Write a protein that binds this ligand. Structure first.
Ligand SMILES: [K+]
Ligand SMILES: [K+]
Ligand SMILES: [K+]
Ligand SMILES: [K+]
Ligand SMILES: [K+]
Ligand SMILES: [K+]
Ligand SMILES: [K+]
Ligand SMILES: [K+]
Ligand SMILES: [K+]
Ligand SMILES: [K+]
Ligand SMILES: [Mg+2]
Ligand SMILES: [Mg+2]
Ligand SMILES: [Mg+2]
Ligand SMILES: [Mg+2]
Ligand SMILES: [Mg+2]
Ligand SMILES: [Mg+2]
Ligand SMILES: [Mg+2]
Ligand SMILES: [Mg+2]
Ligand SMILES: [Mg+2]
Ligand SMILES: [Mg+2]
Ligand SMILES: [Mg+2]
Ligand SMILES: [Mg+2]
Ligand SMILES: [Mg+2]
Ligand SMILES: [Mg+2]
Ligand SMILES: [Mg+2]
Ligand SMILES: [Mg+2]
Ligand SMILES: [Mg+2]
Ligand SMILES: [Mg+2]
Ligand SMILES: [Mg+2]
Ligand SMILES: [Mg+2]
Ligand SMILES: [Mg+2]
Ligand SMILES: [Mg+2]
Ligand SMILES: [Mg+2]
Ligand SMILES: [Mg+2]
Ligand SMILES: [Mg+2]
Ligand SMILES: [Mg+2]
Ligand SMILES: [Mg+2]
Ligand SMILES: [Mg+2]
Ligand SMILES: [Mg+2]
Ligand SMILES: [Mg+2]
Ligand SMILES: [Mg+2]
Ligand SMILES: [Mg+2]
Ligand SMILES: [Mg+2]
Ligand SMILES: [Mg+2]
Ligand SMILES: [Mg+2]
Ligand SMILES: [Mg+2]
Ligand SMILES: [Mg+2]
Ligand SMILES: [Mg+2]
Ligand SMILES: [Mg+2]
Ligand SMILES: [Mg+2]
Ligand SMILES: [Mg+2]
Ligand SMILES: [Mg+2]
Ligand SMILES: [Mg+2]
Ligand SMILES: [Mg+2]
Lengths: 89, 44, 273
RNA sequence: CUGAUAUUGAAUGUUGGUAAUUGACCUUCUAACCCGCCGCCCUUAUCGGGCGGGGAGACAGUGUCAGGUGGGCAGUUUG
RNA sequence: UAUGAGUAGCGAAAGAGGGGUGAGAAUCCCCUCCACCGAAUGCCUAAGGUUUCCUGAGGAAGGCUCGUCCGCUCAGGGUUAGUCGGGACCUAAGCCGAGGCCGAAAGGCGUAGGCGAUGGACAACAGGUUGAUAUUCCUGUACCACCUCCUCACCAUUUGAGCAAUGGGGGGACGCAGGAGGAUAGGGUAAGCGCGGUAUUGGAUAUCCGCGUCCAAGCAGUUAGGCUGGGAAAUAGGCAAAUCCGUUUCCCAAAGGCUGAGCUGUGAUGGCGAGCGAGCGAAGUUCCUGAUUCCACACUGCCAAGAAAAGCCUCUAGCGAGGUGAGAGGUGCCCGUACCGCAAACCGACACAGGUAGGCGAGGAGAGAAUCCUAAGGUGAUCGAGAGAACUCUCGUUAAGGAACUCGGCAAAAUGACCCCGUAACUUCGGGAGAAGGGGUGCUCUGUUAGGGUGCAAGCCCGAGAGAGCCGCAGUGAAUAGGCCCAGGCGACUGUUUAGCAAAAACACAGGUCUCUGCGAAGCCGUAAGGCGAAGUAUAGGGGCUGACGCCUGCCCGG
RNA sequence: UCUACCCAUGUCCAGGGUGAAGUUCAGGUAACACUGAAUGGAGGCCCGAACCCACGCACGUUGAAAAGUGCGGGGAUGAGG
């Protein structure tokens, strides 16, 4: 599989922005991607050194638009901590 | 007072779930009937 | 001996127990234990097929040597132990070659006694021989019906059978019941009365003690309703009110003989009880 | 529960029609059938099967037919 | 869509005022005092729910009123793990079940083998931090498994180190009760120490007042202690083999090991810490008390005789030319993680007086988790304002009388704690019995009594029984806490039962008796296979009747 | 998933009392019996919270609740929850 299949998009929030001060980058990842695959993919794509990857699953949020109930997608969020001697993403 | 429905997801699945239904002829007729009626939910 | 408790409560009044004088250890041989779950009188369908069975104390099975097939190797009685699975006590035998087995404890037997199986053994309490080798009038127990199958008859506390005569292939044996019966002369028996002879005198004393032994209450038929039992119903108390007393399944239950007519073993039964 | 008959064979006397032929009965045999007995093997298996012993044995079990019993259960009647 | 009707109701509970916000305020926010829970109405956490969590905005509907608010609407946001719980580990009941057995069909049963926690096994702790997660992030300090580009030491290349089973053995491995220890958590703040304060209501620099008064896993050491006796030789057994286990013989007798709460040191030149004001930061000891926890089912006793399997250890069978140990470097996946969880978020159609397993559960007085008042902490309850009629409900009191009431003392009243005295018939000799009936009970001084615990002492803690006084209507001054007796029927007894109109004299029961059952038992379930009975075997099992115990249990076999 | 019974595996039960067998010592006898004291800690034992139950009354009866609440009540180491 391609590394760029693994990382989907960056998470841009206040929390994510605060973690970037600590050299921690938050990505949404493929819901099938284990944290080793994420580590490998971040090093491959961005040419950085990864200290650790923490990873969590979000359920879909129930949603309404008028008379139609449904569900947002499940998400897998990875917080990637780079090593202290490393280039920034 | 203890009422009759005491929820428990394991027991729900084991008694009424898809694999329970599939494990007997009569459970497979339930699924056929519910597909025939066009139910959105075939099983617990 | 039987220990009578003092009437310190209504529960305890009349209650008696074994003193367990014969028992020499409190700990069974771990290598001869096997697991034993209760069944509640329920069969493979999960249905109750025997009434009044349920609960009671958890028990481990002690694997008894009913076959007595270590011929010629002497064994020393190491213990006499409580067995929860049967009325008799059991004896751990240390065989000379390092094998350990349990046997039914005969009346008399002592720690240190040597026992021996096989056709060239003495007629001593605790030995086991083919019935062709046992003299007439010998009191025996743990009698086989099929060569090699193991002892089936006369195993309960205090029971005994006497060898009456020899008819070549068969030996006559008076069983505990008093039935005289032909047994194949190749079938083994063990010498002596089974021990724990006082077992029958125990007064259980209270309802709860029956419950500890896995007995659930018996409800009489005559206090059931007609849909439950032939004796059910009637306004107020009623007599049996039927030609015969009846079982719950509508057979006569007082005098009606239930041994199968055309039983194959009828030829071997000389005198019925 | 009981009989007949099939599965079901081999001998031995015995006693009914028929002086030499057929039924009934008793006993014995083993080879069918049975084994909730033992050893071995398939096999890491208290299932099953095979093989060898042992027990039992033409009985039992089972099929068909028959009589008895049978509120255990069923359908009903009880102007 | 009416009527009933502006009626019944608005679902247990303490608020008051000041300030604010706003179109609008009893109801939202803040402040102050007051009040309620406190073996919970607190903290944690199941199951279940599934975003209800946080922030900002909103007010149509939902909310029994209102609403600026909200578990509601709309936007955004929020759940971080080698070590926690689950999986990549183990098995129980049970379930599935290759072949197989049985059966009109469908199927039923069942072996090997699996699945299956509610159990077994198993490596991380303290502190800090966000609006919203935290043994998960951060800091500090660890541990476990595995790997080898490397380093060092050691051993050995076929009488050859080492590894070693999917096999053997050991172990894991187990009940209930009781009491003694040892310890710790927790508690008291007793002493000491530290910081702050000296009052304006008469008094107090005082035996004055308030607040605080420590700390992990890990590593090293030690320990109350608890378990086991130990060596050598020989071996009809442990499916094969064992140098292991079992057995025996001989020798020796306190050694050995195996565990062990906790403690000491280190961890910590750190952290926390009254308070001062994100920072900064004092003292941080001793004494007393003390578990329902731990050592630990350890011990003792008892009968009703108390899972399995793996991890683990060991043994050989094997494998085997490279191994073993210690560093150093490195690797470590998935699932859950928000929030509610005695509740307005779960089960009850409701923001419903009901139900909901488990862990922790402070102080005073107390035997106590009772009780009353409080702590930590939580809460003031989603309609209000008046008025203070009948009547109804829940409470309090009541002259004289005291069951006259009534089917019936129903209801209520009375009794009630501790210590002491004393206690009948009858009895199965246990009981009856808290029988009954009486007495004492506060406070002060003697007095830090005698005496006891702890300690080297100082001290702290427990503490009779006396004597002398003092006060009240009343001293277990509140809350909580048996009414008792005489005689009879029924059932011996503790139990059980008509969920939701019957708790009983009914059922059960221990005991009695009859009867069936010789083991492929009888009986029972099933068409059968297969089962229960029972891994039982006549001192056992099934069925009927009777129902502790005592004395007894007559006559009739014609039906 | 309520409920009846059963099976496997967990767990809960503040406190207080009474004082069975046994044991020890003393006495006691030719031996035993037997007696006393201490010890000991039995029990479907006792009192009593949690918990479980549901006896009486009142209230409720278009309920706060399609079985409850209040005040009393019973069991509370067991045939227990
Ligand atoms: K009794
Ligand atoms: K009965
Ligand atoms: K009747
Ligand atoms: K309370
Ligand atoms: K708002
Ligand atoms: K884990
Ligand atoms: K640890
Ligand atoms: K330490
Ligand atoms: K969390
Ligand atoms: K009844
Ligand atoms: Mg995670
Ligand atoms: Mg019975
Ligand atoms: Mg009836
Ligand atoms: Mg009938
Ligand atoms: Mg009748
Ligand atoms: Mg009558
Ligand atoms: Mg009929
Ligand atoms: Mg009809
Ligand atoms: Mg009006
Ligand atoms: Mg009005
Ligand atoms: Mg009106
Ligand atoms: Mg009115
Ligand atoms: Mg009104
Ligand atoms: Mg209200
Ligand atoms: Mg909120
Ligand atoms: Mg409104
Ligand atoms: Mg785990
Ligand atoms: Mg099956
Ligand atoms: Mg098949
Ligand atoms: Mg579990
Ligand atoms: Mg762990
Ligand atoms: Mg939170
Ligand atoms: Mg949380
Ligand atoms: Mg509620
Ligand atoms: Mg409960
Ligand atoms: Mg308290
Ligand atoms: Mg009056
Ligand atoms: Mg008066
Ligand atoms: Mg009157
Ligand atoms: Mg009158
Ligand atoms: Mg009354
Ligand atoms: Mg009664
Ligand atoms: Mg009762
Ligand atoms: Mg009722
Ligand atoms: Mg009930
Ligand atoms: Mg009632
Ligand atoms: Mg059968
Ligand atoms: Mg069986
Ligand atoms: Mg009766
Ligand atoms: Mg009677
Ligand atoms: Mg009579
Ligand atoms: Mg009791
Ligand atoms: Mg009680
Ligand atoms: Mg009550």
């Amino acid at each position: 599989k391609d590394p760029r299949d693994v990382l989907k998009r960056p998470v841009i929030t206040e929390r994510s922005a605060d973690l970037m001060t600590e050299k921690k980058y938050t990505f949404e990842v493929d819901v099938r991607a284990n944290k080793t695959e994420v580590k490998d993919a971040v090093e491959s794509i961005f040419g950085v050194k990864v200290d650790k990857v923490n990873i969590m699953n979000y359920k879909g949020k129930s949603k309404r638009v008028g008379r139609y109930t449904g569900m947002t997608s499940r998400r897998r969020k990875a917080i990637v901590k780079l090593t202290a001697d490393s280039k920034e993403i | 007072m203890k009422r009759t429905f005491q929820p428990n997801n394991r027991k729900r699945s084991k008694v009424h779930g898809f694999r329970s239904r599939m494990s007997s002829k009569n459970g497979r007729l339930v699924l056929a009937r519910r597909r025939r009626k066009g139910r959105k939910v075939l099983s617990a | 001996a039987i220990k009578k408790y003092k009437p310190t409560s209504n529960g305890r009044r009349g209650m008696t127990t074994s003193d367990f004088a014969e028992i020499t250890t409190d700990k069974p041989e771990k290598s001869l234990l096997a697991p034993l779950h209760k069944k509640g009188g329920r069969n493979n369908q999960g249905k109750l097929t025997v009434r009044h069975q349920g609960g009671g104390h958890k028990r481990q099975y002690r694997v008894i040597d009913f076959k007595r097939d270590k011929d010629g190797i002497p064994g020393r009685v190491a213990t006499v132990e409580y067995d929860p699975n049967r009325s008799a006590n059991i004896a751990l035998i240390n065989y000379a070659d390092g094998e350990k087995r349990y046997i039914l404890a005969p009346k008399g037997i002592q720690v240190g006694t040597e026992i021996m199986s096989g056709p060239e053994a003495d007629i001593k309490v605790g030995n086991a021989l083919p019935l062709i080798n046992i003299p007439v009038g010998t009191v025996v127990h743990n009698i086989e019906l099929k060569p090699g199958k193991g002892g089936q008859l006369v195993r309960s506390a205090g029971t005994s059978a006497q060898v009456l005569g020899k008819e070549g292939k068969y030996v006559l044996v008076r069983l505990n019941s008093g039935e005289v019966r032909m047994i194949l002369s190749a079938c083994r028996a063990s010498i002596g009365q089974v021990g724990n002879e006082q077992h029958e005198l125990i007064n259980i004393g209270k309802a709860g003690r029956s419950r500890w032994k896995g007995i659930r209450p018996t409800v009489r038929g005559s206090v059931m309703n007609p849909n439950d039992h032939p004796h059910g119903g009637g306004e107020g108390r009623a007599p049996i009110g039927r030609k015969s007393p009846m079982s719950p399944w509508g057979k006569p239950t007082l005098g009606f003989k239930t041994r199968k007519k055309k039983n194959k073993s009828d030829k071997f039964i000389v005198r019925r009880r």
